[PDB]
Every structure is written in C-alpha cells, then in structure tokens.
Design a protein around this nucleic acid. Structure first.
Lengths: 181, 106, 315
RNA sequence: GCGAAACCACAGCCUGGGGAACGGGCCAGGCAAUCGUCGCAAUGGUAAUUCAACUUAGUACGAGAGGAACCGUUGAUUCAGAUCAUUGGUAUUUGCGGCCGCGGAGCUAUCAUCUGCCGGAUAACGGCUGAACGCCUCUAAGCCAGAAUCCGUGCCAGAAAGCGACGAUUAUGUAUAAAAAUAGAGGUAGGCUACUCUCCUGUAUCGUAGAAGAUGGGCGAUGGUUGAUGAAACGGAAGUGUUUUAUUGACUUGUCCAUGAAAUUCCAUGAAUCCAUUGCAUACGACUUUAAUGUGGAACGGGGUAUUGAGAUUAAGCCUUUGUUCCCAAGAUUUG
RNA sequence: UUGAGAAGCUCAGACGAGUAGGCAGGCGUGGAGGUUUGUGACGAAGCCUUGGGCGUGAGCCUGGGUCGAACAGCCUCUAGUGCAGAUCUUGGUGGAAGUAGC
RNA sequence: CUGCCGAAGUUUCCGGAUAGCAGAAACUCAGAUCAGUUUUAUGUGUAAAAUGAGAGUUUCUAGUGGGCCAUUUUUGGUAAGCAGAACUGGCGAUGCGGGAUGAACCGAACGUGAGGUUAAGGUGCCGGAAUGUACGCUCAUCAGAAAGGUGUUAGUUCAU
C-alpha cells in the first residue's frame, strides 16, 4: 500500500536501510515525510561514528539524513532534483504530522537487523556535541506532545471500550459469524 | 465518493534497460498487490492505460489516454513489462497507470 | 581574521547579538539600555584598589559621558523558542504611540499621514480581549520576552527627530511575571538609574566613527564599569560629596559636537566606539567576573568641567 | 566627436582517479542561481595572544641559605577593538600675530590615552573501581581526573536565491494519529505489591446498497448521516486544524415496496525610492540625518568659543542661537 | 496462369567487420549528334521555405512564395565535371570593439 | 554514392631480386587428393584408421616487405628489480556487453528490424534484476567488499 503522503517514524531505524527504501519510493513519485530523525541508529559504536564525522558540514540529522539520500539519488539528473523536494525530513513530530499515523519500515528496524550485544550510535546523541544545541527544547516538545497524545489515546481507548461493549451487546454480530467477521 | 475504480492502481517505474543502454519500447510497471512473478501471471494480458490532461480542449474534453498491454513479468517482486501504442514519455517516471481488468480470463 | 572582512556597520544603532542568561529565581528586571555619547572628559578619582602600586591614590583618567534619559516602553514582543531558533510569536504595542516612535517608524515623517498602527490602537481601545488573549498566550507559550522602548530623542539635543527605539530582552522571573511587569511598565518611562546601580562592570555596544577614505564598524567593548550615573534634574550629579561644588557635567562653552546635556547621564571610565552624539547600547555582561577592579567601588574625587572645545583653563 | 590591429575549432568551477596527456570535454563527485519597520539565526571567520615576575612565602622543600603549588598585584607583549578626553605633533579655522612665528578644530599613533573571554570533550598523562585471571588487573564493564589542543563559548558577519513578528496598503475511499519495551511491552482488574488477558501486525479497522445513486409509497428508527450558517474551547508549532456544539436545511439502502432510469442494440471516453537636505560617510554607489507648513528645516547675521599673541578668523568634523529672512502643507519616479 | 525487357520471370540455401589494395554497378555538372510530333508569358532557369513524397545512398520528383525567358527526360558522344581543409587564390563579413585609442 | 573480395604488416638470400599472403586467368580432376587434424602401429620421427573438406597445378599482378602488448621459454642476472634472446598468440584492418571510469583483462567478433534466451558480470540505492534461502566466519577505535597483540574466533595437542 502506498499513499500520496507517508509519515515514517525514524526511531529505532537504521540510517542506510531507511535511506534505501525512501530512495526507491521517492523515485516512484511518492511524497515521504520523515519524523524524529534524531532517533535514527547506525551500526557501530559511538566513537567510530564520531571519528567518521570528524573526518567529514551540516549538523542537523534531518539534513544529514537528507544528505545521505542526496548522494543516494541521481542528483545531477533533473528527475533526481525534482524527487528531492518530495522528501521532508524534520526533527521530532511537528504539529502538522503529530495527529497522523506513523508507519515503520521492517527492513530498517534495529531489532530485526542488529544482533544482540552489538553497539550502535544515535544521531541525535551524536549531533549533540558537533554543533547542534537544541536537544533540551526538542526533547521538551517530545514529552509535551506525547503527554497530550497519551491523553488522546486514553480517550480513544475509552471510546473503543464503549463501542466494543456495544458491538458485543449487538445481537447482529453473531447472527452471521460464519463469515469470520 | 466511494465507488468507481474497476481497475487496479499501478506505478510506471522505468524502461527495459541495461546499465547504460535503454530500450523504451517496453516499460516496467509495478502493480499494487503484486509481489511475485507467479502472482503477476494473473495480470498478464490486461489492458493498462496512461491518463493525463492537457490545456487543449479536444472533442470537447481534456483527457488523453495512451493504451497498452501487459506482456510478461519482470523479476520476483511482481513487476511487469507493458507495451503501449505510443511509447511513454520519459517524464512520466513515477506516475500512475490504471490496469483495467479486461481482457478478463477469469 | 577575527574582524575580517572589514565592512561598514549595517545598523546605525548598535544591536546586541546576545543577552545575559535569565534566572527564574531572580526578580524581573531589564538587562539593556540605550544612550547617546556626548563626549569624553578627564576626571580624577581615588584608586582604592588593595594590593595595587598606587593604592589609596587619585588618578586622572578618561571618563565617557553618555546621556541616558528615561525610556518609555512602547510595547512588548513575545518570542517563542523553536528547534530552528528563536521565533517571534507575536508583538503587542501600547494603545498610545509616541510621535517620535511614529516618526521613526516612517521614512517620511512630514509626508506620512501618521496612520501607522492606527487600526491596532483603535482595535485595542475597542476591544482588549485580543490583547489579553495575546498576552496570555505569550505568558503561557512564549519562552523569550523582549520589551520595545523608544529613547527620548526630543529631550536630547539631537537634530534627529526619530527615537532610537530598540527591543531589550527581559531577564528575571517567570513568563507571567515578566508579562505582568511589562503590562505594568507598558507606556511608562523607565530610567537607567533603576536598571543600573553604577557599581558594576557592563558592556557597551556602538558603531565606530569612520575616518574617511577604516571605521564605521560595530564594536562591543566589555569590562566597562560605570563611574557615576547622575540625574539631569539634580544639580549635584556632576559634583562629588568630597568637596560639593555643584556644577553641570557639560563642558564650558558646550560639549563638543553634543551641546548641553539636561537629562540623566552616565559617566564611565575608558573610551567607547563612535563619535559624539552617537547612539550606544549599554547592557549587563552575560558573564560575571569577580575581579577586584570590577568589585571595588568607584568614587570620583574631581570632575573637570573645563571647556573641551579649544584649550579650556577654568572648570 | 572620430575610431584600429593582433588574435579566434569550440569552449571555460574545480576535486580526484582515469593506465596513452588526460583536463578542455570521460566517469564518480561536489558545486552549479506592494512598501516597508523591528527582530530570529542555517552558516562560516573567529580571539584575545605570547611570556613572565612580586604577592602568595620570602616558605613546603631544605642543616640552613636559596627557594612551594595556588591567590591577587605589577607587568612586558603581540593582536584586535576603540577614542582624540590625556599626550604630542600634523593641521587649508591656512585662522591668526610679526614670507615668517605659530596654529584651533579634526585626524593620527609600540608617539598618545587606553579596553580586551568562557566551560566542557578529552589528548599526552596518571587513575579509582571492576571481569577475563572467585582476587588482582586506567579496561575487557563502568566511574574518572587532567592540555595555551579540540569542541563549545564569546565576538564578527548573515542564507544577496533564509526565517519571524509587525504597520500602512495605490483525483477515484485522493479514509485512518498513543507512547514505549522488543533481550517484554501494552491493556485488564485488585490493594507502587500481588493479577489476568491480548500480541505472533493491516488479508486490520472504519467507510463502501439506490436512474452517482432517481420518483414516490411506506414501515422502521423516530435514530443515524451530514450540508448550511451562530461562535466556544482546545491546539504556539508551523497552533489553523481538533472537537464542542446551537439551531435549521435536507438525506437516510435501517427494514421494505411500486414505478423509473436504456437501439450508444460487443472495446475505444498608499507608502517608499530617486530627489533636496545630508558628512554621522566616502574607489564610485552606498552610507547620513533632515526634508512634503513648523522647536519645519536650510541659510546667513551673529554670539559664544578657542586659536594666534587685546585684536581678526571666529565652525568649517569647536558650541549655541526667544535674531533674521528664504523655501516649502514637494518635484517627479517606483510599486497592487 | 497469361511470369519471353531469356539483359526477363522464378526457386532454394548459406552468408554480411575492414585499412593498404583489387573488382563492379550507379548518382550528378557543362556541352555534342539522335529523340520525347517534350515543357515554357495561363510563367523557363534560378532562389528561399518546419509543405508533400522517392531512393540504403549519391541524388530525385513535387506544393507554396519570389521570379521573368528559357529549359529538360531518354540512348549514345565528349571533358577545363563533383570539395571542408592545402598557414590554399579572390571577394564578402563578424567577434575582438566602440576596445587600443585620437 | 553503394556492393564484393581484402591482405601483408617478413621469411629467405641480399638497396634489390625471391618467397609468402591476397587476387585474375587458363588448365584436371571429386572413381583425387588433401588437412597449424586426431589415431593405429613400426623404429620423438616415420608409415598405414577415423574425422572432415573436392583437391591439385601453370601463367601475371597490386599492396606489404613495422611494431606494440601478452603468453611462455630460457640465460645471465643485478643491490634489487631487471636485462638479454627467443616462443606463441592477440591487438594492429575490429564495433558491441562487462571491468566505477581506463587500448590491451573477462565475454563475444557487426546488414536493417520483431520476439525469445543467454555469455562475462550483477540484483541495498544511484542501476535493469531476491534487502533470496541454508550454513558459518568478520567487529575494524584505518576493517572489509615480517611479525606482535591483557586481540578475539573456532579450536588442536600435551599436562594435571
């Protein structure tokens, strides 16, 4: 299934694997928005990736994730230039996308790709000492949004419980249960 | 506006090509819900179409359609090879192609 | 390379690129002020620095005097911090607008119809609910509060009729406390005497004076301690209590390129960028230093009011 | 105003590799470009720098003498930032007094007076604790300490192709929101302690019934679906959308009927700029205030003021003007 | 069954790089004898044109616009016969350049 | 302008005459001879079965009458490399797929086209094609595509 707008949560996702699936999707004429890019993960411990950046200048993981894709797409080709603008990488979950579903990519999930006991690095933690100086405010927004979202979930859960009780109380439900519904 | 859509959405990926040589006679189409070569057998023979609009009002309408036909599968991920009456423009990469259900074999 | 490239300052009035860190525990108070440098004069002050080679001795040093008339708060600006930086959520101005501020807001004071903010003033008078809602949102959502005030250009003997209005961040207290303080101080004159006790080291920001076909570059001198912050109304502002002799701080025959200063003025040791009759910004230092020089009190002994123009001989 | 010759395959960002130059073309690369007013900072440059001594203490060490870390002071710097107050000169007040004797203003300065960074990360380096190696073990876990370095930090500039606030204003169902573990989470229930249940995805869930969804007859809900407006709260971030509804307008295939919908009789569909003013500038623009009927400004008349040595010039980048008149409630232009 | 331009028509199979070089068939220009009882003031030749065609190609036929006095297809004869270069000859014209400058 | 054939690129004696390659003609044969062929066997050569192809002459006439690379073979070497002769192919007269690009490497040698399938190489993205399956190994704090290691991985052997 593909949509005109797709929101992908970057928490617990490998950078390269996430970059690959979005690179193909972007060439497919699809708009993809990436949120919480600061919580991306890269195989290899913290010092190695720190040395990698020291050899390498954009401090935003949203820019870094965009930069990784930029060299992973035909940038010279005008088609690649057009597809670049269809990708929107932002840190955290902004209000224009907080009230929308956030899907995940199985091919990039750390739990499905990383062996237990393997060291890994977090981009937001990595970027904190390279020029980024907004971790507190970015974090502060995260708990504020999730607290509001959790309250929304509780209201939705209560509504789901009420309708579920109403659904079971409905005699119509088991009239034609032979269809598996 | 629930209803209509007697076809299946599909995306026009690219042409049949080597690493550097492209043959634009046939184009790769990725149909939704098709994810294996054995599955693409069902869509072999269907009539695919490209639908686009233009400023000129021809016959009182504003729609131009380039018909086509699915021919063979392409790889293990459900892609297909479709030949059109007019070869698709190279700009329509990553667009929508409407795979209607005829000629039906079911 | 620190100052390179050498380019003329883009702003005639010095703008502070940074402000001191605000403390919630500390009371709400201002952190910056604007003044016009009238000139520099030589004064004799006792050096009460323990351990110095000339301890308990009087030294003749240059004192820079800048007129600091009370500033009327035109309005407040609510800036909400964002991951991309500090975002100005909104700004609220007072119902009554000063003529100099309106004159400053337009490039053609005489040709203008003085219609600036006329609807906003009319809307505020008609209904204050929007202002209260805006103030409540600033006090509840905005993280940075800046108060916009205009200097007394008309009071100062300056040919320019436009006030050197600037926005100063508010440090101290909570957002609601700052909002309440701004509302209380809205459309009210704030003097530098309450802001500065003239017993601390601050920073002065100003644009240097060009020297023809090198100059006109903004600078921010630091480690500057105010020697005396006098009031123009008081006749003893320029006279110390050591020998009385009440007199005006202005030099004989008028100050060089400044004239006569009648409002509150502040005199500090050392030189500052820019020529006479130039707008300068004085703000508290972001970093606090516990040096003996910055902690020892300043007590002027003799103030020379001789004619700065020409070769004066009588104070 | 009058006016060549030379030259010319075609061009012109580099980075590397490209085997034979290859860079001037090839591949990987980067690069590659309404009027406003006040603010924000992506980004870079970058800053303070090099050494000391006294105090400390004239003492830990040391038989004593000589001389402790740290504290502040005294500084010497270098560099940058300033300014002409202080100091000297320079000096178109080239002003003065007798070509000289000098020179105010202003400029200038290791010629002058001066002002002048922050904590971390850690390097070297030494650790503590702690496995392998029941201990031990800078270390494989961890906890550290510690550099004129680095990063931060501060300063400077500002994305000319960044941003905010703010004033005036000529396609085919385009369907879907928890957080968080994942090596256990969530819910469920009891009083954080004892429970239980689900997961093992979305092929899920919601919605999808009618001449694009007709005409009416009902029945049945007498509910539901919504449209229309009347705003209430929430939503700073990018709140611009989430509900709450108030009433009204319809619709209702919720259960049903009766007609109706076609020969297309096989696919193609008003401000501001220039301008004047302006010196606060000055390769030239820019910059700079004022200026469109009033402290209006601009000019002089001056005065004051110092200069020279009382007098004259007397603000010119010395001050000021209850003095005088001039001009003008501009001249055009730009721009929705 | 008409399919004898016997230099014709028809059938089958394999094959197809190319320098130096060898062989063969053609296209085009000026003029010459024959010819088309050829074309032309109701518009020759030429010229331009994103008109239409033909040939693998050299080349050709045609529409439109200009144009105004000649021209062509076919069989042979014949030669001062085909150009992108030669720091080629002649004429024209640009950038350089409103530059050096006067 | 198109079509066909198309070398030699060097032996050998000695600027050449030969030759050779390519043609062009004339001949005689396929029941006749052959082969950068392979066997059989007699003593690596020679002679006599298979596998294929028709084979042999005479005459006369253009062009070439260099090399580079690679393989190998050796001899010495000579700091060490290497050099020196050869040996045989490929390029040279030859485009295409692959090797990031790249004249020597891996494939394959060319009329215009349609479909089909492949070689070499590839299937994360750029990039056409499985983010295939099974099994291990690799932790790098410069991976990856002589040795040392309080470096691990699997361990083996010997001691208790």
């Amino acid at each position: 299934e593909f949509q005109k707008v797709v929101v992908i949560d970057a928490k617990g996702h490998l950078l390269g694997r996430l970059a690959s699936v979005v690179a193909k999707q972007l060439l497919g004429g699809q708009k993809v928005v990436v949120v919480r890019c600061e919580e991306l993960n890269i195989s290899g411990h913290f010092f190695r990736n720190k040395l990698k950046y020291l050899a390498y200048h954009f401090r935003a993981p949203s820019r870094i994730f965009q930069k990784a894709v930029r060299g992973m797409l035909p940038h010279k080709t005008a088609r690649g230039q057009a597809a670049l603008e269809h990708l929107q990488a932002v840190e955290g979950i902004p209000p224009p996308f907080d009230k929308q579903k956030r899907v995940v990519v199985p091919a990039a999930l750390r739990v499905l790709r990383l062996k237990p006991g393997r060291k890994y690095c977090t981009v937001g933690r990595l970027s904190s000492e390279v020029g980024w100086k907004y971790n507190d405010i970015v974090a502060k927004l995260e708990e504020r949004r999730k607290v509001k979202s959790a309250a929304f979930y509780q209201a939705k859960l209560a509504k789901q419980k009420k309708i579920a009780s109403a659904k079971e109380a409905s005699p119509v439900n088991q009239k034609l249960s032979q269809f598996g519904y | 506006a629930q209803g209509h859509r007697l076809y299946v959405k599909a995306k026009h990926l690219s042409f049949q090509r080597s690493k550097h040589v492209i043959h634009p006679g046939t184009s790769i189409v990725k149909i939704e819900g098709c994810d294996s070569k054995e599955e693409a057998q069902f869509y072999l023979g269907k009539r695919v179409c490209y639908v686009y609009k233009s400023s000129k009002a021809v016959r009182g309408s504003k729609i131009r359609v380039i018909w086509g036909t699915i021919a063979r599968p392409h790889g293990n991920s459900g892609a297909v090879r479709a030949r059109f009456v007019h070869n698709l423009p190279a700009k329509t990469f990553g667009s929508s192609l409407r795979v209607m259900l005829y000629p039906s074999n079911i | 390379l620190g100052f390179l490239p050498r380019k003329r300052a883009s702003r005639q009035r010095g703008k502070v690129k940074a402000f001191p860190k605000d403390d919630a525990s500390k009371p709400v108070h201002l952190t910056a002020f604007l003044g016009y440098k009238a000139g520099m004069t030589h004064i004799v002050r006792d050096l009460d620095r323990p351990g110095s080679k000339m301890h308990k001795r009087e030294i003749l040093e240059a004192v820079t005097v800048i007129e600091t008339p009370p500033m009327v708060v035109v309005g407040v600006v609510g800036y909400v911090e964002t991951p991309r930086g500090l975002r100005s959520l909104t700004t609220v101005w007072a119902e009554h607008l000063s003529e100099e501020v309106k004159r400053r807001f337009y490039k053609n004071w005489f040709k203008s119809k003085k219609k600036a903010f006329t609807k906003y003033a009319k809307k505020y008078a008609e209904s204050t609910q929007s202002i209260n809602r805006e103030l409540e949102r600033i006090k509840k959502y905005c993280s940075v509060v800046r108060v916009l005030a205009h200097t007394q250009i008309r009071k100062t003997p300056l040919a320019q009729k436009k006030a050197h209005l600037m926005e100063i961040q508010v440090n101290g207290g909570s957002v609601a406390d700052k909002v309440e303080w701004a509302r209380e101080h809205f459309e009210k004159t704030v003097d530098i005497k309450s802001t500065f006790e003239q017993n601390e080291m601050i920073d002065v920001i100003g644009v240097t004076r060009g020297k023809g076909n090198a100059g006109y570059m903004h600078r921010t001198q630091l480690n500057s301690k105010i020697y005396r912050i006098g009031a123009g109304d008081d006749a003893k502002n320029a006279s110390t209590d050591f020998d009385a002799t009440e007199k005006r701080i202005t030099p004989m025959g008028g100050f060089v390129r400044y004239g006569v200063v009648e409002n509150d003025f502040v005199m500090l040791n050392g030189a500052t960028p820019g020529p006479v009759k130039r707008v300068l910004t004085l703000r508290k230092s972001l970093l606090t230093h516990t040096s003996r020089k910055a902690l020892e009190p300043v007590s002027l002994k003799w103030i020379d009011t001789a004619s700065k123009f020409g070769h004066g001989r009588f104070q």
